[PDB]
Amino acid sequence: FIEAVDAVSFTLLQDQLQ
Amino acid sequence: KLHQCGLPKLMALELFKPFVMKRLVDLNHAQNIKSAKRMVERQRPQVWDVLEEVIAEHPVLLNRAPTLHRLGIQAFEPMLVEGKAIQLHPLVCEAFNADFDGDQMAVHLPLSAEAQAEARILMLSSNNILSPASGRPLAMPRLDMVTGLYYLTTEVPGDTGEYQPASGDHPETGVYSSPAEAIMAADRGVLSVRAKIKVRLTQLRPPVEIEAELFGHSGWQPGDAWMAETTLGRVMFNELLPLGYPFVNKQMHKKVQAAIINDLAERYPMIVVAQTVDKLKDAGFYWATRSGVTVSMADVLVPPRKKEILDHYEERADKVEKQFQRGALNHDERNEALVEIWKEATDEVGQALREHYPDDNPIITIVDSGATGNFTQTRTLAGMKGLVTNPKGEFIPRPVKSSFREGLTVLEYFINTHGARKGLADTALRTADSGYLTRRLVDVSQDVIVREHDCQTERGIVVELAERAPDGTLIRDPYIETSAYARTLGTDAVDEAGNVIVERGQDLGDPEIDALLAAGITQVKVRSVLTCATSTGVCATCYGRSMATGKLVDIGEAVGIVAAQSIGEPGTQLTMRDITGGLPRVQELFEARVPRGKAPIADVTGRVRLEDGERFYKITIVPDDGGEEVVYDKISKRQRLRVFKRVLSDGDHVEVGQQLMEGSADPHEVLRVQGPREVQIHLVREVQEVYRAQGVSIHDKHIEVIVRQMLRRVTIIDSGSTEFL
Amino acid sequence: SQRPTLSEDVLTDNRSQFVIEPLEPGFGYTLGNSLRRTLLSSIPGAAVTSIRIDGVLHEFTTVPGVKEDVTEIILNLKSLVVSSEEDEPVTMYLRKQGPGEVTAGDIVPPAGVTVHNPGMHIATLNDKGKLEVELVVERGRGYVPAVQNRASGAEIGRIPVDSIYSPVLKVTYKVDATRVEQRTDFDKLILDVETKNSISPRDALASAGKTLVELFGLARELNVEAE
Amino acid sequence: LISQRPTLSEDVLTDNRSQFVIEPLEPGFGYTLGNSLRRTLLSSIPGAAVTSIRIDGVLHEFTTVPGVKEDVTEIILNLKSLVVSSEEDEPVTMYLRKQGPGEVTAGDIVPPAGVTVHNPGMHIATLNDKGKLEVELVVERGRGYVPAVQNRASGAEIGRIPVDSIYSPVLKVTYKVDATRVEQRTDFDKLILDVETKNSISPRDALASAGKTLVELFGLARE
Amino acid sequence: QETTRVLTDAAINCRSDKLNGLKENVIIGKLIPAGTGINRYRNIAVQPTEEARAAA
Amino acid sequence: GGYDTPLGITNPPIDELLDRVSSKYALVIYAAKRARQINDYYNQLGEGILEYVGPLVEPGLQEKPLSIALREIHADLLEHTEG
Amino acid sequence: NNPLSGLTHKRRLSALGPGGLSRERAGLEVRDVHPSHYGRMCPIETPEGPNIGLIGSLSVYARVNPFGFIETPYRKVVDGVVSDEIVYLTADEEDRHVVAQANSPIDADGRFVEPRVLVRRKAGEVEYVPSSEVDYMDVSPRQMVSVATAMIPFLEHDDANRALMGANMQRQAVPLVRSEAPLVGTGMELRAAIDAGDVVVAEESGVIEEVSADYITVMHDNGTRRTYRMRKFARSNHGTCANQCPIVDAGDRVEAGQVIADGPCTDDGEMALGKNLLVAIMPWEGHNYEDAIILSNRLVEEDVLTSIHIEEHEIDARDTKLGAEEITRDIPNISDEVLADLDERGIVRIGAEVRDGDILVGKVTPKGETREVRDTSLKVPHGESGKVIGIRVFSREDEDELPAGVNELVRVYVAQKRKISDGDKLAGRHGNKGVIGKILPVEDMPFLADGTPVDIILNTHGVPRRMNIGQILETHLGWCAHSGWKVDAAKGVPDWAARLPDELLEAQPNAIVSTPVFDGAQEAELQGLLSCTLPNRDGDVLVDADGKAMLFDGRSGEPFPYPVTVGYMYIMKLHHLVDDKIHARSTGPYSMITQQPLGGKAQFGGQRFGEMECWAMQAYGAAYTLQELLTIKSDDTVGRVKVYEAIVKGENIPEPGIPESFKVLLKELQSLCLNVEVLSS
Amino acid sequence: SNNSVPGAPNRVSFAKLREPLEV
RNA sequence: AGCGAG
Ligand SMILES: [Zn+2]
């Protein structure tokens, strides 16, 4: 008991720059 | 519907969150993935419109821990539901062993197209109606539905609007032009749905005899007519079955419904069977309510002769107690005498009770129809509890004489508590023992995969299959549905140089059993997993029919795991009753442990000389050949010798391996002295006997797979010349 | 209340499946049951009520000259479909002779009555035999059992028979939960209706609606300006 | 054939409950019509019930007003038994005030024009020397049961105290059928309905509104 | 079971698993050689029939 | 054809579909491969033509490619060769 | 979550613990009910889990010797005169003597009628013995039942397993907001409550002066006065409310030991764990199939069943190296729509409703090197909601005790008035448990002759086989209690009522009665009572002498062709409410030693796809589904992001890789000096 | 019985015997 | 440590 939006987001933002 | 399961939107939204964002972003409800994430987290109204669309034709796996058998996991089509609970179609309950009393179940989402195909085709609920264990259907009317159908299809003589052959006063006044007229009449208080009437059926195939006689050979029945002396309820029922099924015209006792659904599954496609069980569930639920089967203190009638017979038996108990007071017998003797007398008392009370109840009583109606419960429970309810187990295992010789209806007194309740608590603790431990046995079986027999269409071998075990009676008759052997069905023939059946009745290499189903029994032949050679001549895993034909499909197995079925799980799931139902006789006996057999009481077995034929030695029995088996006189002397005199056609009558010509003493036989010695075939037969025989003591139907072929995996290694005594110990 | 739209799907010329959605949370049942019962027992219709057959005074085992015995004649005449325009009972007569089959079409209907299936087999007359029968037709509503003959001496040959007055033969209804989510569990009433060829199921449903709208208009006629 | 057209007589047992006799109905019919009217009466007779309340010294349902013997939630629970009637659909508001000792009854509410409380004698709270109750209620027309609407759902501020509302003047509806089934077969059903409302509106109007909604609904099927 | 004994024996004998069992492929997360994972069914190739290409 | 109208996840009927292959596993992979092909075609339709083709049959209202694949299998518009 | 659960947690004998046995070594012998338990332990009440018999409860009358032995009282009979000297015996002494049953024909003088009576001997043997021989008799029946089991009316008709379960779940019922006293009970409904300590009890007799919801001030008989302060909406240890409501007025005179205020589950002193609901025992359309229970929507409309579950969310601002945490409205970039709830302190305003995703206590965490603060505000977890009961604050500036480095601590109470919802569990006092399969509208439920809807329906196929028909007698007596009866003494008194005491020949409607545990309403007396019940309003007796009525199908209208067993049964809401059970996950926290998903509702977590499930999947032959259930859904660290991307953008799902947990196994084996290598060539 | 509690409701009982010792 | 389902 000790601890995908941002990863998907970073790929998407690089593509958005494209 | 059978292929459907509910899903609370507060869960489906979270599960399908990955998908809803796509279907709404592309619908422009949002303008980017992150905005869609906001919509979902905000639970904004539009989602419920898109969600309902992205969920259709998207199966999900429902699971219930423990997953005892293969059916524990089933793929359902989800439909949105309000509330917070997964709606489950009641029919599948028996598959999951679930009872809506707080059970929790897990939903898993298959994503990949391969996975969704697996969910839709392999694991869908409607494609799985038959238990892999023995082919007994699981998605069949049970419990409430059984009572509904039993009320609907029974026949009470004397109900409203009977069919009477009246003359002079008026015509029969019992016939009806069509079932439409019957329902119209029954809507008003003119006809009852369990009364004998002569209907003009015009949409159901008549029984075999009526059709064969009236129409001769090929009378179609979607548009013709015929008279039927049935009950309107039965007509309503038979309209539920497919168009082609012959009219049954019986009382749907649970065994009858099992037979009906099994026939449908064997002959008709799977979709038809699923739809048929759906409609049966509907009719059963609708009619059980009107059945008025309810429980009330006025409906639990105590037998009228209870006090007198109880007093007489108590007088006999007092007599034996007086005999004990005079020393006529020991305390164990008087305990046994009291136990036996009170067992007679329980038998008598139960008989009188069953005599007294009329069939219309709700309790006897529930029990007789097979909805649930055994009769002994009703005996306890209005009768006497009988003997109560002392916690060690003995019987408290009081015994309880007060019925639960009449209300137990204090000490009798305290006595009953022993049995209750020991039952609970035994269940708790036996569940773990069963789980471990299941794990071991699964691990031994995981590699056994059907991976070849045909051995083309010629070996194969034989089956007794209704041996001839002593007077002369083919009385069916009790074990056919678990040892003869669903096999492939290794030979061709010919009777007294007669024509070949059934051909080699063909699936053996019930019609061929009836053909064989009619022919006059009992010994049959059948292909089996034991004699499979394949390298890696068994071949298809040597395995035979698959229960769940009903057809010949595929060439990828992991039949080993199916065998292990179908052998393990019955566990947690075998109560231990010295040589073990419960689950621990099955554990000993599979593990091949040496039995407790090694009843010596013969080693050679010939007459036998027996003597009651000093505290033991001396036995000398005259060898028919010049063998050594096998003599056994160290045997406890308590154990009794094997009985047979005599208790090993001095001079019997027991075979080279007949068990001499009555007890357990070591599988190792049996293998040594008789060979692998005999030891395989013995192991399957003993395990089947243990499982069948509790009335469990499991095909051997699973057990034969396990036995095959047990007998695959050989011990060497000659080193040869290649690195062999 | 989203408009309770009514749509229809013919499965045969005289058999329809109507579907009414989306109804109020629970009203689905109220509709379904009220319709079902009214359809079954609110459309007047006629059918043969009694028959007299020549030579039938004490024996009912069979009628000489015809293979079909009494039971076949009465059970088939049960199925006889007749429409009438006169309220008081009417008497029909049928006469046939010679080998062949006696059919529904042989009966001549006078003014005010008609047969909608003249070509329905009734019996087989053979051996140059003669078949003479008389029937009584009456209009009614519902399903009435055979009426016991009060006066034995009055009706020497009268054989009262069960009459299916109602022109609809089988109506059954079910409910569903159309758009449970955004509309919050409204009802979808599925009616299956099967009526004899006298009238189409559309006509039966329309007449049931007419009569029940009037019947509840009776209740409406207590406070016209009610909310 | 039966042509006699059905009737609707009434026997007013009391101002609240009343019986209605409908005859002569077709055989095997009375039960169906009785149940249809019963479901309509229990479900869809519009009325009015308090939809929210506000108390000066309170911010939510879980607390205790100073002085009163009954906590706040008990007060909402007592107010649930109020019976009212509105002639306007807009969310009207009414006030209730009391100081010093003594009990507070519905008769001490000052409803605005139109609305009126039909049960003055009901019991709300038992104020004492230090008691001071000032509560304002909101009433609106409606139908059936509705759960409390959240403050966040509307633009309501902290003070408001939503309460689930029960717009259903009908209290208890039953029926009986005494079929004749005479030997000659001139038979009919004489439905005897019995309606009892919670004083908010006489049963005549309740049954009338039920009939109105039913006529329109079956009118759609008719066409 | 007896993980220590099995591991020691395998280490001494220098045994080599061939990854040809259901349980094994499950552990390492590749297709089990049962059901759809067998070579026959796992290697099915699908393309539309000639008439299907024609209809396009 | 003695069965009621299949609806939802049970249309196509499974038996009529099994007749197109030898065993259910073959059907599963057959339909799933066709579904994969449909999905790739739908995704890559944005750019120029490519070797994937279909759907042969007319898709419904926002169906999952797998359902279209199963429909095609049923209609006997496909051909599969095993390993 | 009750007073009974608190009471029964005391008086609990835990055979396991330090210096004692354990579950692994606990065989079947130590768990049974040794015949010496009679009176010194509860033979019926034990847990069902892996503790059966290891955790019992003390009997009602049991007493503890200074040596630690469990005494029981006994009455000493001296040659046929049952005396009144309650002498406490231990197990050994009780075995020495000969003890008679509690219920015996005492002839109003201490002597026995029947020549021989049921009697216990040294080793628990049960026999008959000459009457003159007997020297000891039990104080009273129900001496061999704990507090919990002693409240099950008609316990003498329930098979021991169902009684066990019912006695277990009486400790689970949630406290409602009415808590009506049960219509049928036993003598324990009072003492239990008073002993539980919830109800404020008059320390000394006096005269009430001031009554208020907050507190009661009572004038003592001699000058002085006392004020009892009341706990209102105090959280319980399991999240239930702990309301106390006064039941006295300003003018009443309170006697010493009187009950002054109700507890969470009390009703004028008696224990009120649930409600009396009108129950029918018919199988209704299958919705009550296999233990499921159907409810009327009335129970939701009238709020018969409803609990107030109070939660507790706490956050603390600490001092870090990069700076000091401080809660305030000055949150990092965020819309003004989400600071509406917060007050000037940055914490949620008391009374403001909160829902999932809302902010309770704004908090900004020193960001340091890479705003000077990032975002770390306490957001209410997923699926929760309700009003903010109260806010407690502790500040270092207030010189209050806090853990080192904690500048401030805040506790927020959010309370939800959870209604009854389908899927939730209900149960009676006989272990007749079941979930709420469907909450029908009030209209389409069966109703009696005069239109009284049944508030609940139970399946009939759970009474006989479970051997707990006690509930049927319970509901029969409950109907008799609700309607009221009057035995007609036209010719003396009816014979069946001969043993019936006075004050029971007549009873007004809703007259609460009691049927003690092992001696009580005999079958004959119950039948006679049912035979004459006063008509409710008109000359109409709904329930015949058989206890079954004529129910009108509310769904169709025609009467059910056969009667139905209707009555008034007491049922309680168990603390297994669905809103605490439901859970889904799509992408949540992952463990760090192995990248599998966490497990638990407190986190997101998944659902353990264990080994038996994997065997099921292998059995079906479904290979790809298993592969993705063990590779991409859980473990493939690269697989998860790629598959999520494919789903969101709609591309095909990629091929699974190699489970990470397998890599961890490989690394552990390598770190164990076993050269485990891999090759494919 | 009496219940010996100064404020207990008069809950009637079916008890056929007396309790020599209160709980 | 306690509990729910089998
Ligand atoms: Zn083979």
Numbering used by the authors:
A (entry chain F): 438 to 440, 447 to 461
B (entry chain D): 437 to 1013, 1023 to 1090, 1097 to 1176
C (entry chain B): 4 to 230
D (entry chain A): 2 to 224
E (entry chain D): 1227 to 1282
F (entry chain E): 27 to 109
G (entry chain C): 443 to 812, 830 to 1140
H (entry chain C): 28 to 50
How did the manuscript describe this experimental structure?
Based on the RNAP holoenzyme’s original structure, a promoter escape mechanism was proposed. It suggested that steric clashes between the extending RNA-DNA hybrid and the σ-finger would destabilize the interactions between σ4 and the β subunit, while interactions between σ2 and the RPitc would remain intact. This would allow RNAP to escape from the promoter, eventually leading to the stochastic release of σ as the contacts between σ2 and the TEC are subsequently broken. Subsequently, interactions between RNAP and the − 10 element are broken, ultimately facilitating complete promoter escape and resulting in the final formation of the TEC. The concurrent loss of RbpA and σ4 density aligns with the finding that RbpA helps position σ4 on RNAP and the − 35 element. Next, our series of structures shows how the extension of the RNA-DNA hybrid within RPitcs can result in the disruption of σ4 and its anchoring of the − 35 element to the promoter complex, prior to the disruption of the − 10 element.
In bacteria, the core enzyme (subunit composition α2ββ‘ω) catalyzes all templated RNA synthesis.
